[PDB]
Design a binder for this molecule. Sequence first.
Ligand SMILES: CC(=O)N[C@@H]1[C@@H](O)[C@H](O)[C@@H](CO)O[C@@H]1O
Ligand SMILES: CC(=O)N[C@@H]1[C@@H](O)[C@H](O)[C@@H](CO)O[C@@H]1O
Ligand SMILES: CC(=O)N[C@@H]1[C@@H](O)[C@H](O)[C@@H](CO)O[C@@H]1O
Ligand SMILES: CC(=O)N[C@@H]1[C@@H](O)[C@H](O)[C@@H](CO)O[C@@H]1O
Ligand SMILES: CC(=O)N[C@@H]1[C@@H](O)[C@H](O)[C@@H](CO)O[C@@H]1O
Lengths: 47, 47, 47, 47, 47
Amino acid sequence: SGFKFLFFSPDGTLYGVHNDKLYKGTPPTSDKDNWLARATLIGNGGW
Amino acid sequence: SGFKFLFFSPDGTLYGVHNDKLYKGTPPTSDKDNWLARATLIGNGGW
Amino acid sequence: SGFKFLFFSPDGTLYGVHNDKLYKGTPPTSDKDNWLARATLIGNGGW
Amino acid sequence: SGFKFLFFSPDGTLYGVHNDKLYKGTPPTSDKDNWLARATLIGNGGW
Amino acid sequence: SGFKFLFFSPDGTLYGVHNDKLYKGTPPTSDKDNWLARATLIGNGGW
Ligand SMILES: CC(=O)N[C@@H]1[C@@H](O)[C@H](O)[C@@H](CO)O[C@@H]1O
Ligand SMILES: CC(=O)N[C@@H]1[C@@H](O)[C@H](O)[C@@H](CO)O[C@@H]1O
Ligand SMILES: CC(=O)N[C@@H]1[C@@H](O)[C@H](O)[C@@H](CO)O[C@@H]1O
Ligand SMILES: CC(=O)N[C@@H]1[C@@H](O)[C@H](O)[C@@H](CO)O[C@@H]1O
Ligand SMILES: CC(=O)N[C@@H]1[C@@H](O)[C@H](O)[C@@H](CO)O[C@@H]1O
């Protein structure tokens, strides 16, 4: 399923909508980085 | 049904299309922030 | 119908694909702004 | 006849995926500009 | 199915989601460029 939206802010922060929730964080630089687990949850639903 | 589009302008304003309407505003400050309730309505339909 | 694509250029111009046509213009600032009626048509189809 | 992706690079170049091919070029400035006929094909398949 | 997302970071790095994996790299230079073969894998699943 994965993300519904996945996009950058002009400040370089990666944003994503995943299971109707909004997340942000620095983009991963390696495939061992569990991005979703460490991303900042900034929206609990509705996205 | 969530958003149809969700994207940034170059100055870091978040834009979104929700129920055919267009909204803009600073991005959510936390998961406590009801963005859609405070976003500026900039289009009533047709998006 | 609504837009198929709706996105910004780095100079802050809003671009949209609507009914296979490509449009650009300054983003709307209020819900009184009929954006599609004033946007510059820059592609008459195929988008 | 219908793009899959259509988006800007931060350097102002328009990118588009059309039928599994990737194209780039300066954005069109009028509806007389046949963009896809003059765009640089930078990817042939897999997009 | 090709890519699910395909988008730029603000410094001009191309990001893409392909078969649930996240890749980044300089954008394709020409159709001689096998982008997916040389892109950096930065996320293995979940995208
Ligand atoms: C699209 C939108 O604004 N969603 C928000 C959600 O992110 C936030 O967690 C909640 C707090 O009450 O309010 C809204 O539902
Ligand atoms: C896509 C578009 O330009 N929609 C606008 C809408 O946002 C605005 O509220 C209305 C004002 O009359 O005109 C148009 O319908
Ligand atoms: C996808 C694309 O390049 N479409 C263009 C269209 O925008 C333009 O109005 C027309 C002019 O002849 O040529 C092409 O159809
Ligand atoms: C998604 C991707 O990297 N596609 C490329 C394609 O654009 C390029 O023309 C071809 C060259 O052999 O290699 C790959 O298929
Ligand atoms: C959406 C997300 O954060 N996916 C990551 C994936 O990129 C990474 O390869 C994996 C490491 O085990 O962790 C998570 O699955």
